[PDB]
Amino acid sequence: RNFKEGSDIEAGVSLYQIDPATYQATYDSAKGDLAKAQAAANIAQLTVNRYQK
Amino acid sequence: QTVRSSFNNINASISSINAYKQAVVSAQSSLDAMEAGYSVGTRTIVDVL
Numbered sequence A: 001r002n003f004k005e006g007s008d009i010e011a012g013v014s015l016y017q018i019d020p021a022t023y024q025a026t027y028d029s030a031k032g033d034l035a036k037a038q039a040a041a042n043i044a045q046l047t048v049n050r051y052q053k
Numbered sequence B: 001q002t003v004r005s006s007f008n009n010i011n012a013s014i015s016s017i018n019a020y021k022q023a024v025v026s027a028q029s030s031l032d033a034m035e036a037g038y039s040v041g042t043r044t045i046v047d048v049l
Helices: A024-052 B002-039
Strands: none
Touching: none
16 A cells, blocks of 8 residues: 555555556566567568668 | 671671670669669678679
């Protein structure tokens, strides 16, 4: 828990740090598969810059 | 037969030139497809040479 109970909370403030260990894993397994997209889209980008010349 | 040999050699050899003058224009295009293809990186230096 990240709040003093009974206090006045601002919007967008952490109330409870929930266990991330199965969501941090998916967030890495999206960001891991992000880099599977934007390494291949690095190259298909760079092929076209080698073909426009 | 000798005169017509040379006259039909030179009529060949004009067309032989215009063959191999195009074969330069082929190979000069293929070379410049390499020098532009190697300066950007798609073809290597041995595919140039």
